[model samples]
Target chain A: TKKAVAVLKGNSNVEGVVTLSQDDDGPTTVNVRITGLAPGLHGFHLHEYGDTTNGCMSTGAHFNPAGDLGNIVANADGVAEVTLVDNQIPLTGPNSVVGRALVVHELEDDAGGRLACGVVGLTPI
Target chain B: TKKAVAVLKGNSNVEGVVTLSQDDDGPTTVNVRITGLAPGLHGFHLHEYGDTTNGCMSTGAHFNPAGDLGNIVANADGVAEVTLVDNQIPLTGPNSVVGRALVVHELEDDAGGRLACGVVGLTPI
Candidate 1:
């Protein structure tokens, strides 16, 4: 059993959404819901592939694969504002990533530049 | 034929989506997908009509039928960006706006700011 969900945006203004739920219960439950967005904070995670057809640039780079570049901080003992380490890039339910892709980096990804994609399939609900 | 598929996100932080399809074949096959991004090249297309609803500011403004405000990238066939005119913005089909939103503005929108949304239903593989 595997799963996927994703989003990151741009067009008239700004946008956001992220949901990656893969559960054998080993730490793969990334759910985030945002609207319009443009207050201050920006820098989210999970990007390896979703194939947006090379406009926003194929949604590649920054799933880190244990290189753990930065961010994703909530309880790895908290202390990240925008440094780049683990801003929540964890997937091990068998992480080979099916349909893999989700991005939002206009700035703060720290890994740097050109992103806005969402592609992951497996939705019964 | 009527269709709706949606996205525009935030979690690891930032996202995008727009795809509202309906075809008596006048104009109803709008498609756009983005990925984790951060670069100099920003501002893609399709706004004034998607439902990210109230964050990037509900993907509103700039689809201007005759009001016109700015930026749609080499449209109708040339000239427009970061200003106040009719950019790419076009949806004449049955124009009630199937989905109603899409945005990519850290800056350079000109109708105003905050937009990001994607939701327009109908798709059958």
Candidate 2:
């Protein structure tokens, strides 16, 4: 991709493709500018790792910086969605987790396993 | 379990689980009473088939009664959720898809491919 790419739904009912853009603005924000959505509310978030090779299966867990094995969304701290799970890591302003990975899972993150995955890169463009 | 089960995020970040109840009052309705969900919005819906043996794979496409592919969700006649993409199929009263599978996929329904799958059984409790 132009910079970094994300993959959701390793091989099953994949929602679609999500592209992340990094600009010198605030933090690393994601804008989902696509359509063809089912008509209900879906989940979105940044995963820990990405593969996209073996039908995007070999991907690891979520980018849990603190090594938190529990479902971030399930714990009192996580939210209640699946795909749109953004971490909002501070990048443009200062020290942030820029070069990481993002993902869109099949079900709710519930701080669980990997359904879909993608990687993030910091390009000088 | 004592009742029919629902499987979302097949082999992935499934939101948890949901159960549908059939009473003599209304039609066949589903109730998602689980936890461990990620933050933000997620997708949810009913599929056309059910095959949870092989990691819930091989569950065919959505239960498009009329063979209408083109994503019921992405299309103007669909919702925008994956895990919770319920069709609200009528059963007890008039015409409706009684026996079908339910599923939850990654990203938005975009009316794309298979992500996760589950089977639905309408029995007299």
Candidate 3:
């Protein structure tokens, strides 16, 4: 990763790999690859804390400043991938992506429950 | 049970047994005994759906009409018990408890995550 990275892991079957790259404090690019989904559209969002010591529950609610990237759809193979430029998330400063978490829900932000979560951490420059 | 019963089951360490008795929609008496807690107060409530096909995820949110039974305290041995008299939850008519779910959380009315859930079903009354 050019700036930061996060690897999604959960007790469930869902797993993901994510990288975030940003130039200055502008829009951050998020490249995500996930597998073991239920082959449907699911809500994807960022959480305020990366605290997964208690798993996804301790991650807190969706980050207001992080906005939302909407839904991610899984293929029949149970895989999903996306690459987007986000303006709300940052790789620097206090509201940086590091120490935060990215979450994907079982449904649309409105799911039976959360499916996967990963903590954002800084990568080598 | 003389009216209805629910055997709390979960994927976690938590497990519970519950029985509900009501006479013509009056205040229903709930007797609950649970084990495998973290030795603290936890939120206990009823869910609109008894669906555990997805485990606790498919249980849905708390039933508004069913109200809430507040929190149940666990002993040092990680066990909790309660006998509640609720006017909202019913065992007869359309808004019955059967086919619904009883949920216990890791925290009070709130939690790090759900810990236990059981379906309320009618008994041979």
Q: In DockQ terms, which candidate is top?
A: 1
Model 2 reproduces a share of the real contacts of 0.00
In CAPRI terms, where does candidate 1 land?
A: incorrect
Per-candidate Cα lDDT values, in order, are: 0.42, 0.38, 0.73
lDDT of 1 at B37: 41
- Shift in Å, residue B16, candidate 2: 2.6
Error of 2 at B22 (Å): 3.9
What is the per-residue lDDT of model 1 for residues B36-103, given as tens digits with 9 covering 90 to 100? 44433345445543333234454455454332222333223222222222322332243433234445
lDDT of 3 by residue, B63-123 (tens): 7655577888899999898788888887655466554678889887756577887656444
Estimate candidate 3's alpha-carbon lDDT, on a 0 to 1 scale. 0.73
Superposition error at A112 for model 1 (Å): 24
Among these predictions, the greatest lDDT belongs to 3
TM-score of structure candidate 3: 0.49
- Model 2, stretches more than 4 Å misplaced? A1-125, B1-9, B23-25, B34-37, B66-88, B91-99, B111-115, B122-124
Off by over 4 Å in 3: A1-125
